[PDB]
């Protein structure tokens, strides 16, 4: 079932038999991270490491004690020793709580992994905070997105993604604390 014993370590001594001997081995993306999945530990009680990422930003890499994630089944929350989870997220608000303070980022969709060591790895594309969203032009395009209904199924999918994004964005600009 695993007849290809791959890995960064095994690639080294095989590459020393086909390449010229003048070149050092290429690096791998495993050599640039110490935080693994099955590496046991990484919780110490109540606050767990939350690596909330972005292609253009690292929005938080310190620890929080509960993260409210907007999954496609619905909003869920992650405690310290949560079950391992690969959660696809809807457009919704990722809420980071470490205690009494709470930051709310509205994300565009993108997965969030809970690894067996308890590290949460939220991975979205556009994660704007709710301070820099406008409540005016969202319905100006949502009422436009609730109008253009073509038979083209490619644009029908993009209009469906246009509807549910502004529908969850308006629902999370009405009920703010």
């Amino acid at each position: 079932e695993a007849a290809a014993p791959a890995g960064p370590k095994e690639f080294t001594e095989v590459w020393n038999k086909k390449a010229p001997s003048t070149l050092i081995v290429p690096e791998f993306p495993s050599n640039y991270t110490a935080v693994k999945a099955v590496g046991e530990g990484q919780v110490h009680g109540d606050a767990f490491p939350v690596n909330f990422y972005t292609p253009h930003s690292i929005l938080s890499q310190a620890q929080k004690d509960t993260v409210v994630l907007p999954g496609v089944d619905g909003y869920f929350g992650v405690k310290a020793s949560h079950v391992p989870t690969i959660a696809q997220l809807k457009p919704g608000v990722v809420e980071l709580h470490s205690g009494a303070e709470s930051e709310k980022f509205f994300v565009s969709g993108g997965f969030a992994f809970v690894h067996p060591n308890g590290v949460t790895d939220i991975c979205v594309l556009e994660a704007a905070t709710l301070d820099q969203v406008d409540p005016a032009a969202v319905k100006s395009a949502l009422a436009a997105a609730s109008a253009a209904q073509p038979t083209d199924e490619f644009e029908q999918a993009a209009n469906r993604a246009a509807i549910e994004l502004y529908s969850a964005l308006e629902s999370a600009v009405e009920a703010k604390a």
Binding site: P55, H56, P91, F106, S108, G109, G110, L125, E126, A128, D131, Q132, V133, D134, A137, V138, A141, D152, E153, F154, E155, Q156, A157, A158, R160, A161, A162, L165, Y166, L169
Partner: protein, 72 residues
């Protein structure tokens, strides 16, 4: 013909889908932060197939507003 989510059955990949939801979030940002999000929205590259080894046709992308919503 595909079996999966609503973007996948409609031929669209997840990369174009999640960038569409990233494109449409940037259109409703506040203007002190909407124009700086237009920098990370622009697509400027070009591509060319190589079927024989040296010859190929061309394709040019010069978009400044995001990934195309219509079919590629």
């Amino acid at each position: 013909a595909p079996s999966g989510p609503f973007y996948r059955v409609a031929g669209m990949s997840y990369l174009r889908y999640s960038n569409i939801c990233a494109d449409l979030l940037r259109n409703v940002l506040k203007e002190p932060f909407k124009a700086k999000a237009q920098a990370r929205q622009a697509i400027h590259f070009r591509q060319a197939p190589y079927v024989d080894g040296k010859a190929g046709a061309s394709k040019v992308y010069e978009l400044e507003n995001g990934i195309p919503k219509t079919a590629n």
